Amino acid sequence: MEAIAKHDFSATADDELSFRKTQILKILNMEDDSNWYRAELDGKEGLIPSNYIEMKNHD
Numbered sequence: 001m002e003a004i005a006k007h008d009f010s011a012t013a014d015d016e017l018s019f020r021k022t023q024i025l026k027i028l029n030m031e032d033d034s035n036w037y038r039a040e041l042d043g044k045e046g047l048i049p050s051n052y053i054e055m056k057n058h059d
Helices: none
Strands: 003-005 023-029 036-041 044-049
Touching: 023 044
Parallel strands: none
Antiparallel strands: 003 023, 023 036, 036 044
């Protein structure tokens, strides 16, 4: 599963994840939180604002 996110951001929870507009994020756990997804980046897992991204990460 892969997702893209165009909205700058910086996690609001410790187990959350910041990112940049147009960044490629590894979508991997969505469900217990229909609003914050657990994505991967570099070597860290972390929740991420849903409204700042949409499905279609691709490259």
